[PDB]
Structure 1
């Protein structure tokens, strides 16, 4: 077939949350998923022109001591468009997970599952499959170095070359 399947896993973001600064609803990560954000896919984005997302998961990897009065809710909402960053809105999505900050966790969302576009558009419903949000629950006793990782499997289409 003409379609090219790429897979990888990349750090979407890394936030450092100081000793006492989290509270119910504080947005610690808000990452809109674009090929530029996943470095290996960022390169293959310049070779093809449309990409379609075949599997997406986000691994929340917070790094703090086991004595942290932590808490987060992590979710992937499928519109890059909207800013509805509240707990209930995250928990309404499929992947949604909640955990104490000393607990790793994986969000397995359900998404567009459709053909997209490797470069910006007038209508951005076809340039990004969604965005990953990470919210505080309660308030952290200790310093947290959260890094979220996106594992991705993508099928790429129409050859091209954007310089």
Structure 2
């Protein structure tokens, strides 16, 4: 059948937060989940027209010394159009996490499994499952290298050969 099931785990974001610039509410990461953001899924969506996100998980992997103060709040807004970047908006989303800067965590988001479009278009809601937003909570004492990883699983349909 045209449907092929792919899974993988890749880094959606890499950010560096210097010491003291991580004020409360600062936006460390704001990544709109698109197939191009994921390498293997990037090629897979380059050879397909439609994709549906069966499973989606995120892993916040901040690489900082244990003596680092402050923390982060990480969430997955299931609306690509939504631009709210406050603590309450993230915490309202299912699976959002709050953790110290030296404590890696996992986000298990909730979203609607609809058949999306691999290629971009006018309406972003038909192409992306949502956005991942990672904000600072409090103040960080050291420099934090944050890697945001995404464990994904998709179903691909309508074969084609697209261009970026």
TM-score (norm 2): 0.97
Deviations along 1:79-136, whole A, 9 cap, x unmatched? 1101100000000000100000000000000012110000012222110000000000
Distance in 2 (alpha carbons) for counterparts of 1:22 and 1:122: 34
TM-score (norm 1): 0.98
Cα deviation for residue 49 of structure 1 reads 0.3
RMSD (CA atoms)? 0.8
Cα deviation for residue 70 of structure 1 reads 2.1
Cα deviation for residue 141 of structure 1 reads 0.5
Structure 1 residues not aligned, in runs of 5+? none
Cα deviation for residue 2 of structure 1 reads 2.9
Is 1:133 aligned to 2:116, yes or no?
Answer: no
> What secondary structure does 2:117 align onto?
coil
Cα deviation for residue 153 of structure 1 reads 0.3
Deviating above 4 A after TM superposition, structure 1's stretches of 4 or more consecutive aligned residues are none
Q: What does 1:100-115 align with in structure 2 at a 5 Å threshold? A: 100-115=100-115
Q: Is the 8 A contact 1:70 1:102 kept in 2?
A: no
